[PDB]
Amino acid sequence: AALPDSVDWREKGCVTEVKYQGSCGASWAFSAVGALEAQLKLKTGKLVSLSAQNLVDCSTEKYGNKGCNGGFMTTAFQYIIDNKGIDSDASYPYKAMDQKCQYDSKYRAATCSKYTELPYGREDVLKEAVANKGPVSVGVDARHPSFFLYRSGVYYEPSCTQNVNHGVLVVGYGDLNGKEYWLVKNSWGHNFGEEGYIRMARNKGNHCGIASFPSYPEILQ
Ligand SMILES: O=C(CO)N1CCc2c(c(-c3ccc(Cl)c(C#Cc4ccc(Cl)cc4)c3)nn2CCCN2CCOCC2)C1
Numbered sequence: 075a076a077l078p079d080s081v082d083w084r085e086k087g088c089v090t091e092v093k094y095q096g097s098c099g100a101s102w103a104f105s106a107v108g109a110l111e112a113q114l115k116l117k118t119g120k121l122v123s124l125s126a127q128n129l130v131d132c133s134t135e136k137y138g139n140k141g142c143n144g145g146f147m148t149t150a151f152q153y154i155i156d157n158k159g160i161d162s163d164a165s166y167p168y169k170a171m172d173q174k175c176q177y178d179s180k181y182r183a184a185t186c187s188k189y190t191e192l193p194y195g196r197e198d199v200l201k202e203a204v205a206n207k208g209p210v211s212v213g214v215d216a217r218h219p220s221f222f223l224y225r226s227g228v229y230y231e232p233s234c235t236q237n238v239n240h241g242v243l244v245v246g247y248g249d250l251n252g253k254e255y256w257l258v259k260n261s262w263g264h265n266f267g268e269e270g271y272i273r274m275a276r277n278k279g280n281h282c283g284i285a286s287f288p289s290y291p292e293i294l295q
Contacts, residue, residue: 077205080248082257088112088208089245090123092270094263096170098142103129104261105211105241106150110160110291112208112245114184117293122183123163126261129153132175141172147211147241148289151189159185185293192288195236195280200256200288201247209245210290213238214258214274214282224267228253229282230275236283244288247276256284 083089090111093104103126115121130141133153139145154160162183166176192199192210203210215235216222228250246257255273264270275281 077201080246081205082246082248083112083204083209084245086115087121088115089243089259090121092259092264092266093123093126093168093261095168095261098130098170098172099144100126100130100142100168100170101241101261102139102145102147102213103127103133103150103241105213105243106147106154106291107160107163108243108245108259109147109209109211109289110151110154110184110186110293113291113293116208124184125161125163125166125168127163127168127173128161128166128177131173132157132177134175142170148189148191148287151186151289151291154184154186154291155188158182186291187294189289189291192285194286197277197280197285200244200285201276203288203290204244204247204256207290207292209243209259210288212242212244212258212284212288213286214240214242214284216240216242216282221272224272226268228255228273228275230278231282234282236280236286238283238286242272244284245271254278258284 159182165181
């Protein structure tokens with residue numbers, strides 16, 4: 075045991091406000107910028123919301139992504155590398171639909187040097203990345219009423235699978251009343267769960283596929 079028993083990156087002012095994706099399946103775009111927003115804060119001291127809409131409109135078919143019909147955080151990061159930047163959310167706000175690409179380099183608020191993917195199903199490796207690097211973009215299996223209806227406590231769904239279909243951000247981990255959890259930031263607004271967060275069962279056999287496809291970006295000096 076060489077890691078903290080608990081982490082929460084919100085407490086270092088590294089997490090932006092919970093967003094609301096609505097009826098556009100842009101959880102992957104929110105997951106991606108969430109993670110890159112923390113690296114930018116660590117780097118620059120400034121906490122700035124980055125443009126998930128930029129990803130939806132611009133990180134498209136060349137990156138295997140389909141906008142509001144889904145995509146991946148790893149290739150969202152590759153776009154941001156290839157494009158040599160991403161706009162701030164305030165210059166390029168979220169509309170919850172597919173649009174023409176309107177990136178403007180004058181409004182670039184972050185960059186990406188590289189990203190790292192973690193091995194599938196490894197909750198000890200995920201825990202290390204979150205303690206030592208920052209918030210980690212993950213997929214979860216969110217296709218269950220109990221997920222949609224989640225209010226509080228440590229989520230555990232018996233019929234949850236490791237096949238992921240929903241992009242979220244791991245911003246911490248800990249133990250609440252006997253139950254180890256990952257602290258997860260969703261993009262369903264503030265009225266979902268614990269002011270927009272869900273604590274999901276940890277060290278429970280890759281529960282809901284939380285450790286199936288982690289990745290995190292880096293901004294180097
Ligand atoms: O789960 C498995 C196998 O166990 N999956 C099959 C294999 C897989 C899944 C996810 C993955 C990771 C994270 C997220 Cl977030 C998602 C998603 C999503 C999503 C879908 C629809 C909408 Cl509307 C929104 C989000 C998928 N990543 N991968 C790895 C494949 C990555 N690649 C290879 C390179 O080009 C892009 C696709 C899913």
